Amino acid sequence: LNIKTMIPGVPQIDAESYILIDYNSGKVLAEQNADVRRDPASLTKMMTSYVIGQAMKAGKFKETDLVTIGNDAWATGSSLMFLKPGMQVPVSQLIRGINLQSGNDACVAMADFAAGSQDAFVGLMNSYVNALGLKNTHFQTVHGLDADGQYSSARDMALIGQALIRDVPNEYSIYKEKEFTFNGIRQLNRNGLLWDNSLNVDGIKTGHTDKAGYNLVASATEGQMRLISAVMGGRTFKGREAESKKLLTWGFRFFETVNPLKVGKEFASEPVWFGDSDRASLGVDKDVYLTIPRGRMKDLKASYVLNSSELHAPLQKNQVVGTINFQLDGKTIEQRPLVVLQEIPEG
């Protein structure tokens, strides 16, 4: 009974807010103050990078194209790290600026390159905020420096992390590079968790300011399963990576993600009346991913009901005709629309 139906206690997290979600199912495994609005500091860069990734996915420009450093990037010497006006730097180098402590000039140069001005780019950032359904996020700048007013939340930063991975995977593969060239200089990635040999961490963005505290969006995998954590307003230097490691590790220990049905696969067969054939093939039009307590796969039950006494032609491909019900311990934990996998026209 009890160890099986157990609800795991959540580790203490020495931070102001956090959330732990599964990349595939979207399930929230743990959260604290996940919708509280806070300054994300350099985490803002995740959205900048999302837009750039969309631009590249749309084929507007590529990693080899040369970019011109404007009086723009400069305006925001003794140092080799800074892009000087008039130099030409490949996109490949600039976008990897996301992995740096600064590299704020690179954000500006890329923003002008992709959308003409910093303010129009920000306009695109806020547009995507809206397209992703984010309720507690708004940006003022492309790098988050001088934006006393910029805000996001543990939940929204996690969701932006999820979007990068999902929508712009080529932009995302950049985050795990431990070392890369930036402005002719060999630089190390700021995400120390990439070097942790206990977990397989491959993203995403860490940041710290005195005002916003330590901030980190991370993502890790274990075989076929991927988790995303967001910990904001982390209080100590010592916990800057350890708090998230603990959270991710906990997630993998107590939860597992299953893929009970993929699109196109016949979940069930059903008789159809009045059609050019007499059997309908039923499934889903979106892959099914469920996150359940680890070790309960075998207890997962799947069934379905039909939205009407029985099926009549005509049926359209992907026509919703019922509901798939998944349960654990008699309880229904997830429902999904049952769809017709192939059209059955009237006889």
Side-chain angles (χ1 to χ4, degrees), residues 39-74:
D39 184 352
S42 67
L43 287 197
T44 284
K45 293 176 195 195
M46 296 182 271
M47 183 52 97
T48 293
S49 165
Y50 183 77
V51 170
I52 287 165
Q54 283 287 19
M56 295 195 83
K57 184 177 164 190
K60 310 271 221 162
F61 52 86
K62 33 160 138 165
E63 309 211 20
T64 51
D65 296 331
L66 247 36
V67 177
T68 287
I69 308 319
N71 324 316
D72 222 21
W74 182 256

Side-chain angles (χ1 to χ4, degrees), residues 97-307:
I98 200 167
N99 294 331
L100 303 165
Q101 168 110 130
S102 296
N104 302 306
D105 50 5
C107 301
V108 173
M110 284 296 321
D112 286 351
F113 191 73
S117 72
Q118 272 176 89
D119 292 342
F121 191 95
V122 173
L124 286 181
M125 295 169 73
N126 289 321
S127 283
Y128 283 104
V129 164
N130 237 263
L132 296 160
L134 313 189
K135 307 300 195 303
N136 294 291
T137 292
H138 176 259
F139 302 106
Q140 296 189 189
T141 65
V142 311
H143 43 235
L145 257 164
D146 291 278
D148 295 55
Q150 67 166 22
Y151 60 83
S152 187
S153 63
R155 186 190 310 276
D156 287 12
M157 275 303 156
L159 287 181
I160 288 174
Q162 184 189 50
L164 280 157
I165 299 175
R166 181 185 71 228
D167 307 336
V168 289
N170 302 332
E171 176 75 7
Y172 185 76
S173 68
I174 253 81
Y175 293 107
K176 68 182 189 301
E177 298 186 13
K178 289 186 181 93
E179 177 156 61
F180 48 92
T181 295
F182 179 80
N183 209 32
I185 309 147
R186 259 28 204 32
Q187 280 290 322
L188 298 178
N189 197 308
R190 283 262 124 186
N191 184 5
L193 272 179
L194 295 174
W195 282 263
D196 187 300
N197 289 126
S198 134
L199 259 166
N200 195 74
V201 172
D202 65 10
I204 310 196
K205 186 65 175 88
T206 184
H208 175 280
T209 70
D210 288 352
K211 38 75 168 181
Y214 292 93
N215 299 101
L216 168 59
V217 174
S219 185
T221 62
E222 235 165 57
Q224 30 277 122
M225 187 181 174
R226 175 188 286 279
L227 299 179
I228 295 169
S229 60
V231 174
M232 296 176 88
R235 288 154 181 139
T236 80
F237 173 91
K238 266 151 205 283
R240 81 204 179 284
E241 309 174 319
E243 301 300 294
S244 300
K245 179 183 182 168
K246 191 215 252 145
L247 192 59
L248 299 162
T249 279
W250 173 88
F252 282 128
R253 186 195 312 149
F254 297 108
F255 302 94
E256 72 191 47
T257 292
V258 298
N259 187 18
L261 185 59
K262 307 185 99 176
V263 11
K265 304 281 172 284
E266 176 176 292
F267 180 73
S269 202
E270 190 70 42
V272 165
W273 295 5
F274 311 117
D276 251 333
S277 65
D278 57 88
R279 214 78 190 174
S281 175
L282 312 172
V284 299
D285 61 357
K286 204 193 202 285
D287 262 80
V288 188
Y289 284 98
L290 315 178
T291 299
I292 67 178
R294 186 159 291 268
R296 299 278 268 132
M297 206 277 131
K298 60 304 296 170
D299 307 301
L300 224 223
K301 264 47 220 165
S303 52
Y304 70 94
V305 299
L306 279 202
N307 280 136

